[PDB]
Point group: D2
């Protein structure tokens, strides 16, 4: 059964880029609800699967994807942020960003654009395409998780649900995006990247 | 283990409205493939469940919905047809059709139009809305099954995938729809309805 | 050229059910953005259509549906609210609700459930089904408008995008739904209903 | 005014790989219906635009995408096939295929997989990603066209609607895909590729 992970930092640690109330609500209410609903749905799915009830299995798919994807996504998201984050990555990850997007700044432009571009709720991602052996940017709607729906391995996610920024930035999602670069934990993104090449 | 159901009649029994070559391919290849693939997918989902691998669970959803849906939908379809079919229903179902659609012929027009209106692959349905306590027509894409995706109880389904008609009617789906009324098993449709008036 | 309609009341007219900060942001920022983007998208569509550029037309569809949809839906929503609203509708609209949903209370529970049920961004609707001549509840994702995507005529819509409630109710969307019943403009819903007896 | 392009060859020129009955129906019935529905839908769209009728614009989108996409996709497809085709491309296009997919044979495996993988109606594509400056494989549902929905420039498309193969290969879509390699017009695919780097 799934459990809600502790953040790697206190709720106010990402101030002033992401305020404390957002972090507290986002973690203790939104991600919490994902975990609790996922446990409930998984238990129902097992019963349906055991009885061979295919209609029930299919009726449970939206809740499984939404809550299961929210747990996957939020869990990665917390680790992708740090009070000591910002700047640029180094080494092989920086080399690949240059290779695949031209420059770190071009890369930032493209993830920002993919994130700003989500109409409704969703996520922007930097992922790794294992088949092509290179980085790839992708957007996902609602809580659809990157690897389970696209096969890309997630490296850095940007939540652009309104609850991720509205209390502080209101409708101005581009101000949130500008601010979040200040808290990206490139050490974590680097670790995820290197794990794709072993 | 799911199994391919036996048909209630021979492959040639619906001639000349649905030819024998279509019935044999439809049942022994298309539905058979949905059953075989569904069994594999359910096995993989049990393993994913046992591991708490939510990514694997979500990645299996399209195959489960497609092949599970195709098993649900084709199994109902076979029972909805008969060499001894055709004509109009009677009793309570007929009275329900007049109550909700005006007349049997108006109903036929509306289910025809929903079936003709599917762009790409899919199904037209006459269903029962338990909340509203009345009949309802709906169309579904690909193999998305009626009850698992809409909550409606399926009473009569019309497969409008090209494999359901193309060998005989080619591009002219309305000719197929006109023909299929001659083989509807209204006795089955009535049993499904009464089991809704449970 | 589409324009932002004035609200029928001041920004704090719906206190304390929907606060003045939400009303001012919702109207002057969110709906304003829909209007501007719709005007720009329409002009680009016109250009594409004159050149017979089908690719360009299809690339513009997401922006047109989203911003066109947002303009349609927000414009209806302001007219569906009033400082002099709430309670139960008077006249034939209440008789139709009782007929189709059993009672006002059950109707409230069902539209609340459809609105709570939206996963991600979207709208709950009370619509009119002209073909069947009765009321119908439907949910729509993002800004997809009811009539253009389902054919139902909108009577009453509930915006359940997070910007519609988050600053005041945070994650507790059901508290928002409980509150909005106090400001429904049944005179407007009735006008819309009477215009469907057509 | 859009028009139905003549095929570049006779209906029987792709025998035995794609038979004459399929080519004749596919062009004279399927593509032909797309062209007239496109023209009619474009004229309705002009009227809706002139009136500022946003609901009408949104309600016409499914017909515009389906039939405009069908026109785009089928027009490319006829040019992608040749009685003098088959084999492998040469020059820059082959070098890009090796760079991006490993080898021509791995490319064929990957476009076959994408095309086999479509559940329901749709298309497999080799495209060009202009932002990344490299090749990319993608699948599209129904008649959704590649460039208009994904941004990728189409180079080679494989129709896997059942009407593209069923009369000849019945349910065995993999046997159609094996066969079609024998009639790919690599001269045309090369022309399309080189135009991407102008
Ligand atoms: Mn979130
Ligand atoms: Mn079928
Ligand atoms: Mn809104
Ligand atoms: Mn085709």
């Amino acid at each position: 059964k799934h459990s809600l992970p502790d953040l790697p930092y206190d709720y106010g640690a990402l101030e002033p880029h992401i305020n404390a109330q957002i972090m507290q609500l986002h973690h203790s209410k939104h991600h919490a609800a994902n975990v609790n609903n996922l446990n409930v749905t998984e238990e129902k799915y097992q019963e349906a699967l055991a009885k061979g009830d295919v209609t029930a299995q299919i009726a449970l798919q939206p809740a499984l994807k939404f809550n299961g994807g929210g747990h996957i996504n939020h869990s990665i998201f917390w680790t992708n942020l740090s009070p000591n984050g910002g700047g640029e990555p180094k080494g092989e990850l920086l080399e690949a960003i240059k290779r695949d997007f031209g420059s770190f700044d071009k890369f930032k432009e493209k993830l920002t654009a993919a994130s700003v571009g989500v109409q409704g709720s969703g996520w922007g991602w930097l992922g790794f395409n294992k088949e092509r052996g290179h980085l790839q940017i992708a957007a996902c709607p609602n809580q659809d998780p990157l690897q389970g729906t696209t096969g890309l391995i997630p490296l850095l996610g940007i939540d652009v649900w309104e609850h991720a920024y509205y209390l502080q930035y209101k409708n101005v999602r581009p101000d949130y995006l500008k601010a979040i670069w200040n808290v990206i934990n490139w050490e974590n993104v680097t670790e995820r990247y290197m794990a794709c090449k072993k």
